[PDB]
Design a protein around this motif. Structure first.
Motif, mmCIF file in Angstrom:
data_model
loop_
_atom_site.group_PDB
_atom_site.id
_atom_site.type_symbol
_atom_site.label_atom_id
_atom_site.label_comp_id
_atom_site.label_asym_id
_atom_site.label_seq_id
_atom_site.Cartn_x
_atom_site.Cartn_y
_atom_site.Cartn_z
ATOM 1 N N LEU A 182 -3.464 2.166 -13.468
ATOM 2 C CA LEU A 182 -3.267 0.979 -13.579
ATOM 3 C C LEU A 182 -2.358 -0.375 -12.801
ATOM 4 O O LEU A 182 -2.962 -0.596 -11.982
ATOM 5 C CB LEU A 182 -3.100 0.410 -15.377
ATOM 6 N N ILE A 183 -1.369 0.761 -12.774
ATOM 7 C CA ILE A 183 -0.740 -0.159 -11.667
ATOM 8 C C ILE A 183 -1.042 -0.053 -9.810
ATOM 9 O O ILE A 183 -0.563 -1.394 -9.695
ATOM 10 C CB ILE A 183 1.148 0.394 -11.831
ATOM 11 N N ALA A 184 -1.014 1.154 -9.727
ATOM 12 C CA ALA A 184 -1.940 0.865 -8.646
ATOM 13 C C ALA A 184 -3.374 -0.348 -8.839
ATOM 14 O O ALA A 184 -3.120 -0.725 -7.256
ATOM 15 C CB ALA A 184 -2.404 2.411 -7.833
ATOM 16 N N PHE A 185 -4.234 -0.084 -9.490
ATOM 17 C CA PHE A 185 -5.181 -1.494 -9.367
ATOM 18 C C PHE A 185 -4.747 -2.874 -9.486
ATOM 19 O O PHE A 185 -5.635 -3.229 -9.021
ATOM 20 C CB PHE A 185 -6.065 -1.081 -10.457
ATOM 21 N N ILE A 186 -3.206 -2.603 -10.173
ATOM 22 C CA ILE A 186 -2.750 -4.311 -10.359
ATOM 23 C C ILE A 186 -2.579 -4.737 -8.863
ATOM 24 O O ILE A 186 -2.334 -5.447 -8.288
ATOM 25 C CB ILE A 186 -1.818 -3.889 -11.383
ATOM 26 N N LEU A 187 -1.704 -3.660 -8.670
ATOM 27 C CA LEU A 187 -1.473 -3.555 -6.849
ATOM 28 C C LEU A 187 -2.790 -3.943 -6.148
ATOM 29 O O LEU A 187 -2.529 -4.798 -5.125
ATOM 30 C CB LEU A 187 -0.521 -2.427 -6.077
ATOM 31 N N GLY A 241 -6.980 10.357 -7.217
ATOM 32 C CA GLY A 241 -5.848 10.216 -5.974
ATOM 33 C C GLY A 241 -7.020 10.011 -4.431
ATOM 34 O O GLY A 241 -6.204 9.682 -4.228
ATOM 35 N N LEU A 242 -8.030 11.001 -4.518
ATOM 36 C CA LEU A 242 -8.851 11.572 -3.483
ATOM 37 C C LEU A 242 -9.401 9.429 -3.425
ATOM 38 O O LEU A 242 -9.531 9.017 -2.434
ATOM 39 C CB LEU A 242 -9.546 12.062 -3.551
ATOM 40 N N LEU A 243 -9.740 9.680 -4.772
ATOM 41 C CA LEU A 243 -10.639 7.839 -4.551
ATOM 42 C C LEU A 243 -9.860 6.407 -4.326
ATOM 43 O O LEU A 243 -10.039 5.563 -3.937
ATOM 44 C CB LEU A 243 -11.064 7.743 -6.167
ATOM 45 N N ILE A 244 -8.211 6.775 -4.838
ATOM 46 C CA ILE A 244 -7.129 6.038 -4.192
ATOM 47 C C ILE A 244 -6.901 5.805 -2.510
ATOM 48 O O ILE A 244 -6.826 4.963 -1.604
ATOM 49 C CB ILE A 244 -5.644 6.296 -4.613
ATOM 50 N N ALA A 245 -7.455 7.349 -2.947
ATOM 51 C CA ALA A 245 -7.528 7.369 -0.413
ATOM 52 C C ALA A 245 -8.354 6.691 0.006
ATOM 53 O O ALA A 245 -8.648 6.332 1.010
ATOM 54 C CB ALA A 245 -7.058 8.621 -0.153
ATOM 55 N N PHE A 246 -9.659 7.256 -0.791
ATOM 56 C CA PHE A 246 -10.773 6.313 -0.113
ATOM 57 C C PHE A 246 -10.886 4.444 -0.304
ATOM 58 O O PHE A 246 -11.630 4.231 0.557
ATOM 59 C CB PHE A 246 -11.992 6.912 -0.861
ATOM 60 N N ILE A 247 -9.587 3.965 -1.755
ATOM 61 C CA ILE A 247 -9.720 2.319 -1.377
ATOM 62 C C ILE A 247 -8.413 2.078 -0.244
ATOM 63 O O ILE A 247 -9.310 1.413 -0.556
ATOM 64 C CB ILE A 247 -8.828 2.588 -2.947
ATOM 65 N N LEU A 248 -8.015 3.114 -0.112
ATOM 66 C CA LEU A 248 -6.584 2.971 1.254
ATOM 67 C C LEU A 248 -7.520 2.528 2.596
ATOM 68 O O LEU A 248 -8.247 1.805 3.158
ATOM 69 C CB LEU A 248 -6.060 3.752 1.080
ATOM 70 N N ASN A 249 -8.664 3.684 2.529
ATOM 71 C CA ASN A 249 -9.193 4.105 3.645
ATOM 72 C C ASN A 249 -10.535 2.683 3.761
ATOM 73 O O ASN A 249 -10.687 2.253 5.015
ATOM 74 C CB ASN A 249 -10.028 5.096 4.150
ATOM 75 N N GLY A 250 -10.877 1.948 3.097
ATOM 76 C CA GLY A 250 -11.652 1.011 2.668
ATOM 77 C C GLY A 250 -10.010 -0.073 2.809
ATOM 78 O O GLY A 250 -11.250 -1.723 3.872
ATOM 79 N N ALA A 279 0.814 -1.372 -0.031
ATOM 80 C CA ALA A 279 0.124 -0.033 -0.266
ATOM 81 C C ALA A 279 0.522 1.295 0.281
ATOM 82 O O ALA A 279 0.399 2.431 -0.573
ATOM 83 C CB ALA A 279 -0.398 0.031 1.066
ATOM 84 N N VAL A 280 2.107 1.512 0.593
ATOM 85 C CA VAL A 280 2.979 2.467 0.831
ATOM 86 C C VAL A 280 3.223 2.678 -0.428
ATOM 87 O O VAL A 280 3.714 3.921 -0.963
ATOM 88 C CB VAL A 280 3.745 1.842 2.162
ATOM 89 N N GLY A 281 4.428 1.845 -0.779
ATOM 90 C CA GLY A 281 4.085 1.750 -3.087
ATOM 91 C C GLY A 281 3.519 2.128 -4.000
ATOM 92 O O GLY A 281 4.009 3.046 -4.477
ATOM 93 N N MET A 282 2.193 1.462 -3.415
ATOM 94 C CA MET A 282 1.264 2.317 -4.251
ATOM 95 C C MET A 282 0.825 3.668 -4.788
ATOM 96 O O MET A 282 0.496 4.396 -5.348
ATOM 97 C CB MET A 282 -0.402 0.784 -3.673
ATOM 98 N N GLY A 283 0.883 4.033 -2.717
ATOM 99 C CA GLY A 283 0.687 5.161 -2.657
ATOM 100 C C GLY A 283 1.888 6.533 -2.953
ATOM 101 O O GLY A 283 1.587 7.472 -3.978
#
Lengths: 649, 73, 320, 49, 73, 73, 73
Positions: free
Chosen positions: B64-69, E62-71, B9-13
């Motif tokens: 896409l890389i984040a979704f793959i992660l 990125g806010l959606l990615i953060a929402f995915i992280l909080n999920g 998750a840290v790498g994806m962020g």
């Protein structure tokens, strides 16, 4: 595909040439040509023809300025067949009435503005001028100035006549009308000293700052009382003249533009010493219409339609699309680029073949598809309204043909879009959370998903493989088009280069799937060796030093096709996240704010659509123009298009 | 017991953040030249907006890389 | 873009400049000694023959060779900056073009000195129906004149008041672009030039009695609009009011000849401050202004030798 | 970072004339090979994952 | 568990902060050119606001990615 | 629990700090052009203020994500 | 506390430092334009101070985040 576009000449007498030019402009389906060089004259028409052309051009310019001062725009229509002096006489009266009304409107508007700028100030200063109007002993220094800094000028007034220089500022609080009065010459010196302290005289333009203040106030009040009804009547008579004469002016402008185009076309003739010839190009499909136009010549003074040149040296050849009726709408996106080299591969078919397919693979929201369908219904109603689409801040003025081509392209996009959205199984996003129309083994509500696409653990490699296969196929098609065009032009450089790039790409894909891919590299080791040998052999046979940089650039162009699957997955994940958040915050958070939560989620979805779908659609056509054109070239000298005789109508 | 999910998750962020930073770094000069061209005329605003949106493929590949992660998670 | 790779050739061209003794020794010549010294000079490399017109044509060719390339060889924000250095000849060519279109003489009437864009564009602009169409034919992207004439073009078809208001808006948009750049000194030099041109319009229009606010411009920092009206009136104290600014020696003068001479002196002194900036663009502007002072000195010495001027007759021309 | 100044110069060249849009797009797409190799190494890592 | 959940919020922060960093990076020269265009005329504010608002799509992603992280945590 | 809440606070602080960094990065050129326009004309102060306040949405989003992390804290 | 207090202080310090960096990044071009306008005229000190203090809200939000961290501490 581009047509044959044959060349053609004819000759006759000079008046016969003028008549045939009028007919072939009425039958304006042939682009012209210079043909200056040999055995012919320059066909300089006449000084009388030059004078009549200058007269008609000035008439067209006057009609344009008349429409401009009328505010109307030049709309083409059926012309008015009339004499040149007769059309000038029809133009001159309306143009004179319009010019006089426009000058009167500008003058009355500026006069009403200048009157309203100093109306009450002049009246209050005139009420203060009840004791020296034109008295020949003391001037009246007026200064409509700022707020009460009256002591700063009263220092200069103390420098003036000390128990004198009657100086006060009464009223009209937008500006303190400081009126001072002492003398003539000492007051001139004191006005100089006060302007050194900072002062200004009430110097109005025209007669108000040039006549006596009581008379100026009377004239300003008269103009202020009179200007409104005069301006209203001026606008009324101007609009009445516009609504009464705009059609006649438009027909006159059309006939004038037609005659002026005929005159400018007469400059391109090729005389034959009291006789004249002409030549150009036209497509083969209108050769019957060309013959039908040719019959109107006097004994049909002979037109010869000779064939066009080969793949060598056809640069003044005209260019045209000539696509199918299925392929007619796809030309509008291709029109943003340049034209071909008269024998190049018309890639307009592959555009409608693939761009809608990749677009439907991109967006899979059936609710956004129905939103696009409703927007196309609104645009179709605008087209049925037969009004040109006018967008002010977007500056988007559109005739109905381009809008209808856009609507047909939108319907053809939406068909395969709904097809792939059913393949992805997503209605306005993931409605399967609320109403389980999509079917998974986790919670089977209804029909199964071909691509689930919420899970990438089973679908992502398949999607990437699909994108890679489509990209390699398009790359193969483009390199094949390049090699086939090099064979068609009989220039072995481009064809051998396309062959070598194709072999290098094949060996590159083989070595990639062998080493970096799976095991069992026996079936493809000779394949990679053969691709490398083809690349080296075409390097020797080409010697262009178009290095591994070119091969790696082609490889990146091939591998860039996965951005389609990337953007599709991105938009799908965003839509699913927004839909899950909305369905949760509506139903699971209460099941009572379903209206409020569903409306907020739909509004955010509309905002995300407006922020994303434009570039999402743009990436497919960007990939298309960046791949299918670029592997096939499409950047060589841009061609010369079919510019036939206009007859704007 | 495992923090490899936290590391992924840290790498994806960091991936998504650096991708958005690069997309913004392109979009700055892209929109600067495009707004200059829009200030010139309303003629080539479409090609300007096309070139502006053209930089989004980097952020798309990062997503896409984040979704793959995330699918690996 | 790179304000240093151009600055290297700028330093090389700064190495190619004549000293003050090259003109001080040129105070005594007979146009043959001056022809020999110019034959020693690099500007005499285009030296065609003998005569004042051949000398001026050679000077123009040398100015095009050594100064015209600065408009080229650059791209980007540095190009947008350096374009607004050699802009007076371009506005002069546009003004002569507007004067010829409104007058009716031949398109080959004016001699059309070298500027920034292609001269073929200026030849093609001789035939244009709309003034906005002529502006679009003359439209470069970073040309400030193209944006100025188009904005000033929404008044009439072709007027002389349109031309004067276009010059006013040209100076105004030049000041707007000078404020709209990341250059610490170019804005100051342009504002100094703007205030000097305001003072020049004031001295040229002193005693005319016209509206000064219609004549006064915006963009300066050395003067005031009330000071502008005081200069419009017969008050040399406002010229004496210039204290502490670059208009220092401009005091006690009423004659416009020595007034604009000292104005050019103050402008060249401000241009001499451009050697402080070896990394930006003002050093190249200083080189251009140095070549300009050399060009004025060259045509001055050329007139002096061709007409046999006294040394006292041009003694007020080389004081700075 | 590569795309920024390249697209700025391409937008300037497009504002010059509409003719050179093809070479502008060619120069624009020329920089994506770094992203291509990065995604390739990413797929190599995911296969190693 | 007490380290797996801890790195997740750190990754979410590394996402969101660098995302807003790139957002402001794109916003800077774009808004500067838009302010110059509005200073040129009170007629080009619309396309300026459009190009200004165009950069926030990466911030929304990125806010959606953060929402995915909080999920995720 | 061990080093979980401290890592979460570290991530939230990193998000807020780089968000304010990007907001100031936009606001630098924004306020530069706006102050140039304000010195040009006081009449353009409102559009300049609107363009200056336009960068604060990133700060609002970062503060919201920080409050989300604090609720997670 | 253990290690959560030290990592909490570390995150608060990183937040405060990056927020001050962004605020000063804004204030650089802000004060450059303001001193240019002050060199233009002394009749703008009442707006230059407002334009300067416009970037202080980022420092205020970062200080509020640090105060919330210290209250959680």
């Amino acid at each position: 595909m581009i047509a044959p576009m044959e060349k053609l000449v004819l000759a006759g007498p000079k008046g016969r040439a003028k008549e045939l030019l009028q007919s072939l402009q009425q039958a304006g389906v042939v682009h012209l040509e210079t043909l200056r060089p040999e055995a012919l004259s320059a066909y300089q028409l006449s000084p009388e023809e030059r004078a009549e052309l200058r007269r008609w051009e000035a008439v067209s310019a006057g009609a344009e300025h008349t429409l401009s001062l009328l505010g109307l725009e030049a709309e083409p229509a059926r012309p008015f067949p009339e004499g040149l002096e007769a059309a000038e006489k029809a133009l001159s009266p309306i143009q004179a009435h319009a010019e006089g009304l426009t000058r009167q409107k500008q003058e009355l508007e500026e006069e009403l503005a200048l009157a309203q700028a100093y109306l009450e100030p002049l009246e209050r200063l005139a009420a203060l001028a009840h004791g020296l109007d034109k008295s020949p002993f003391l001037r009246v220094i007026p200064f409509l100035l700022t707020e009460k800094e009256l002591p700063l000028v009263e220092e200069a007034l103390r420098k003036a006549l000390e128990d004198r220089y009657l100086l006060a500022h009464e009223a009209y609080a937008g500006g303190v009308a400081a009126l001072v009065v002492v003398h003539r010459k000492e007051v001139d010196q004191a006005k100089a000293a006060l302007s050194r302290a900072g002062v200004a005289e009430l110097r109005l333009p025209g007669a108000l700052g040039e006549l006596p203040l009581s008379e100026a106030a009377r004239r300003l009040k008269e103009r202020a009382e009179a200007a409104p009804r005069e301006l209203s009547e001026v606008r009324q008579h101007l609009a009445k003249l516009a609504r009464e004469s705009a059609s006649t002016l438009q027909s006159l402008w059309t006939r004038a533009q037609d005659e002026v185009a005929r005159l400018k076309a007469l400059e391109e003739l090729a005389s034959g010493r009291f006789g004249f010839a002409l030549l150009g190009y036209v497509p083969v499909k209108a050769k019957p219409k060309v013959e039908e136009a040719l019959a109107r010549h006097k004994e049909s003074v002979v037109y010869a339609f000779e064939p066009v040149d080969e793949h060598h040296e056809a640069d003044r050849i005209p260019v045209v699309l000539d696509n199918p009726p299925w392929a007619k709408p796809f030309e509008l996106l291709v029109s943003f680029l340049n034209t071909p080299k008269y024998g190049t591969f018309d890639p307009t078919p592959v555009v409608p073949v693939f761009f809608p397919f990749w677009f439907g693979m991109i967006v899979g929201d059936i609710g956004y598809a129905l939103l696009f369908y409703l927007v196309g219904r609104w645009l179709s109603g605008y087209v049925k309204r037969n009004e040109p689409l006018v967008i002010d801040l977007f500056a988007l003025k559109l005739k109905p043909q381009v809008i209808g081509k856009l609507v047909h392209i939108l319907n053809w996009m939406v068909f395969w879009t709904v097809v792939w959205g059913v393949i992805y199984g997503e209605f306005f996003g993931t409605f399967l959370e609320h109403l389980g129309v999509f079917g998974t083994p986790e919670h089977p509500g209804l029909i199964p998903i071909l691509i689930h696409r919420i899970d990438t653990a089973k679908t992502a490699n398949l999607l990437i493989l699909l994108s890679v296969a489509f990209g390699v196929v398009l790359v193969f098609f483009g390199l094949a088009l390049r090699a086939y065009l090099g064979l068609k032009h009989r220039h072995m450089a481009h064809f051998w280069e396309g062959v070598g790039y194709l072999g290098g790409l094949v060996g590159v894909l083989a070595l990639a799937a062998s080493y970096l891919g799976n095991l069992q590299a026996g079936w493809l080791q000779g394949l990679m060796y053969l691709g490398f040998g083809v690349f080296l052999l075409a390097v020797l046979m080409s010697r262009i030093w178009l290095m591994i940089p070119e091969i790696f650039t082609q490889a990146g162009h091939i591998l860039s096709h996965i951005r389609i699957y990337a953007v599709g997955a991105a938009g799908g994940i965003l839509a699913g996240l927004l839909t899950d958040v909305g369905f949760a915050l509506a139903e699971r958070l209460g099941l009572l704010g379903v209206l409020l939560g569903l409306l907020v989620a739909g509004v955010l979805h509309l905002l995300i659509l407006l922020l994303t779908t434009l570039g999402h659609m743009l990436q497919p056509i960007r990939l298309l123009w960046v791949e299918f054109f670029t592997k096939f070239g499409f950047y060589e000298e841009n061609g010369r298009p079919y510019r036939p005789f206009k007859s704007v109508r | 017991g495992g923090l490899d999910r936290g590391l992924i998750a840290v790498g994806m962020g960091l991936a998504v953040g650096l991708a958005a930073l690069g997309t913004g770094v392109a979009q700055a000069r892209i929109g600067a030249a495009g707004v200059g061209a829009i200030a010139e005329d309303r003629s080539n605003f479409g090609t300007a907006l096309i070139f502006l949106l053209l930089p989004e493929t980097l952020v798309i590949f990062g997503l896409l890389i984040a979704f793959i992660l995330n699918g690996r998670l | 873009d790179d304000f240093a790779y151009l600055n290297a050739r700028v330093r090389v061209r700064r190495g190619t400049l004549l000293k003050e003794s090259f003109f001080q020794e040129a105070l005594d010549l007979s146009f043959a000694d001056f022809l020999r010294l110019l034959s020693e000079t690099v500007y005499g490399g285009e030296l065609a023959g003998q005569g004042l017109p051949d000398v001026d044509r050679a000077v123009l060719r040398t100015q095009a060779k050594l100064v015209g390339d600065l408009p080229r060889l650059v791209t980007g924000e540095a190009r947008e900056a350096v374009r607004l250095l050699l802009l007076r000849n371009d506005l002069h060519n546009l003004q002569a073009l507007l004067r010829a279109k409104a007058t009716g003489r031949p398109f080959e009437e004016v001699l059309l000195l070298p500027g920034t864009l292609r001269e073929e564009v200026w030849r093609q602009a001789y035939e244009a129906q709309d003034p906005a169409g002529m502006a679009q034919v003359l439209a470069v992207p970073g040309h400030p004149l193209a944006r100025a004439l188009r904005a000033v073009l929404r008044e009439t078809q072709d007027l002389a008041r349109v031309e004067a208001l276009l010059a006013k808006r040209f100076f105004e948009d030049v000041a707007k672009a000078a404020k709209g750049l990341d250059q610490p000194a170019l804005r100051d030099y342009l504002a100094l030039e703007v205030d000097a041109e305001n003072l020049r319009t004031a001295f040229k229009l002193q005693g005319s009695g016209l509206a000064p606010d219609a004549f006064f411009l915006k963009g300066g920092r050395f003067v005031d609009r009330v000071r502008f009206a005081r200069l419009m009136e017969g008050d040399y104290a406002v010229l004496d009011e210039l204290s502490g600014t670059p208009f220092s020696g401009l005091s006690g003068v009423r004659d416009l000849k020595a007034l604009e001479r000292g104005l050019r002196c103050v402008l060249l002194k401000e241009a001499k401050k451009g050697v402080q900036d070896p990394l930006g663009v003002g050093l190249v502007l200083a080189y251009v202004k140095e070549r300009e002072w050399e060009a004025v000195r060259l045509r001055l010495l050329a007139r002096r030798a061709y007409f046999g001027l006294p040394r006292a007759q041009v003694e007020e021309e080389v004081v700075c």
